[PDB]
């Protein structure tokens, strides 16, 4: 129950806000979508357990995903851009400590690191 | 390159800083390590390319993850925490748009979003 | 979106108004309902997209459905009345032109023409 | 027996009227067609029963569809635009109600609705 | 289409307020959730139609269910506490009468009566 | 040990009073009855142990139901109305918090909630 719209601000805090709408909601998941003249945006949210095992620990998994598709033009076919995050932690763990992670990762990644990553600079 | 030491600031800005070190670099990927008495920190950065197929678009993938492990104490067994992201785009795509999408995804996620997401809100 | 309530004005403009309520949402579909002592109202909205084929044009379908149900009384058994529309167009098409075609189809249909169509003359 | 020409006013009551001509009349069915420099129009009208089998109500069907095609230009291949309505009701039913329903549906659909469906809102 | 949040006031009117959130609603049902340090709240709403058997009346079930669970602390293991209501009526009945019966049931229940029932006096 | 007469006020507070009479009580169960010219009223109360599972918590249930019957009149056959609630919790628990949960459930249901719930809203 995050809201009726999801706002995507391309270029970080730069600007160019996009406001997606629910399209679907099933199985603790959500669909967001919005089309434009030359492309479209899609947002996805999921939650899930892992299969129970006799004596190993039980975990829960979360992820969020963004996707953009650009329609074919000229002789160039159709292609998409994607970007998503995942979090995995044990059942019953402390919320604040797991929240420290993920947030640390988000603070880590910024424009320069994204540029370096694009350059295969491991 | 990307640096010899990586800093993880648990809790985002103004938090506690942990510094890792290079250990290995094989198979287009590199990993970082830091040991401690009660737990440890590890990081990996990897790049990969999907196989060529006679007629479809060719894509590149970037993945970055954080892992934290807690050693068993008393009755409590081993357990772990992770959090990672992936970026996927076509080989010839302009880098700036991919960077902008990644910056948007980074900006969206923050403490309130992580709390709600742990709350199983979809 | 589309609102929580859906209004049917039986008999076109200036007629009798019925107000259905949403009661479900699954599989990219929505359903509306209303109880009556002698009948019942349904309303359904469905969306669909065809899968990808090697070299073909990809299409999507939009459907809107109205149904009337009358409970069996005396000798007369159960029977229903129904009326629905469908829209189909390609993934990257321009919305405005499809909308204009839909407006044309809606404007062509009217009371006298329905009375003619029930007359079996092609 | 609708007439020797069928008129389609693109954009609803706005303007841009097209005039098709009958091409055929076979088996309770009719066709209309009109060629142009870069596109064509076509309309069809059909009526049918259903297969009978023991102790059920017997039903009727009226179908009307609009079809629009655009010829290949440059790299972009051919594609079509379609929009059609179907009416179903029982033999011997009262005509005025079957028209009041159906004309209510015609009144419901307009610019805003078609925009919503193209937006995938349900 | 109840709403985006549910309010539970423990101890009847004038008590402590608790706010639940959407997590899911697929099969005409709904489910709510909220976590706490030592407990969690869950609320679920269901609709169902009883099995059809020829030449007999048709009925409808509506169910509303509250659950509260407390996490184990030492020797004491998990244990749970729920209270739920059910309403059954025939299809096509009058809403007002069923509502009045339910209101009478609700008005009969109160502080003293729950104390008596938990006192086991038949 | 409730008493000799149970009062049902159809329509909640300020409604029409109906006084029932005790008829029987054998197995920790009690029921009340009243006949009428066109209907009939009945109430019941039950208590029971849940089955004992080796090395798990032990639970007990309190149940109460209202039933309303309308005799066949001409074409219309027999039909009935009901409304009942159930309480479950473990042995040795504190009665007052359980009363509080029942109080919350009872306070939630009222005019509007019943009106919307009978409309199949979920
Ligand atoms: Ca930028
Ligand atoms: Ca924090
Ligand atoms: Ca190496
Ligand atoms: Ca009319
Ligand atoms: Ca227009
Ligand atoms: Ca002919
Ligand atoms: Ca109290
Ligand atoms: Ca759903
Ligand atoms: Ca009332």
């Amino acid at each position: 129950a995050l809201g009726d719209t999801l706002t995507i601000t391309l270029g970080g805090s730069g600007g160019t806000a996009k406001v997606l709408r629910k399209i679907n909601q099933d199985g603790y998941t959500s669909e967001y979508y919005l089309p434009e003249t030359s492309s479209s945006f899609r947002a996805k949210v999921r939650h899930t357990k892992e299969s129970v095992k006799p004596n190993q620990v039980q975990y829960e998994r979360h992820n969020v995903e963004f996707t953009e598709t650009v329609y074919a033009s000229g002789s160039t076919p159709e292609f998409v851009r994607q970007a998503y995050v995942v979090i995995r932690h044990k059942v019953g763990d402390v919320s604040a400590t797991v929240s420290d992670l993920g947030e640390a990762l988000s603070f880590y990644l910024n424009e320069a690191l994204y540029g370096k990553l694009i350059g295969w600079e491991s």
Side-chain angles (χ1 to χ4, degrees), chain A:
Chain A
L2 267 171
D4 73 357
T5 61
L6 196 152
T7 301
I8 283 179
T9 317
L10 295 170
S13 175
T16 66
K18 317 294 198 178
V19 285
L20 315 186
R21 210 62 54 73
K22 295 183 288 293
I23 299 313
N24 197 51
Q25 189 275 330
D26 311 285
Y28 319 105
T29 65
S30 294
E31 279 291 313
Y32 292 69
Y33 182 76
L34 188 153
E36 293 83 3
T37 177
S38 60
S39 59
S40 61
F41 297 106
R42 190 172 298 273
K44 292 177 71 68
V45 181
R46 292 180 179 91
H47 318 283
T48 187
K49 300 294 188 291
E50 289 83 314
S51 56
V52 181
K53 293 302 152 303
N55 83 355
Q56 293 81 17
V57 185
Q58 294 179 356
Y59 287 90
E60 67 194 38
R61 175 160 65 235
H62 322 284
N63 64 7
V64 178
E65 168 162 356
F66 287 3
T67 292
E68 183 178 1
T69 187
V70 289
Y71 318 123
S73 194
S75 63
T76 63
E78 183 178 1
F79 65 90
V80 306
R81 322 197 179 109
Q82 210 160 34
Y84 65 90
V85 67
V86 180
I87 288 174
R88 186 273 303 278
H89 74 79
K90 74 181 280 188
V91 299
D93 199 333
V94 178
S95 69
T97 189
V98 298
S99 175
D100 291 331
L101 270 184
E103 166 193 338
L105 188 153
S106 66
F107 183 60
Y108 174 44
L109 320 166
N110 52 35
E111 191 146 70
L113 182 63
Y114 274 124
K116 292 182 181 180
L117 264 291
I118 292 293
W120 272 60
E121 183 178 1
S122 314

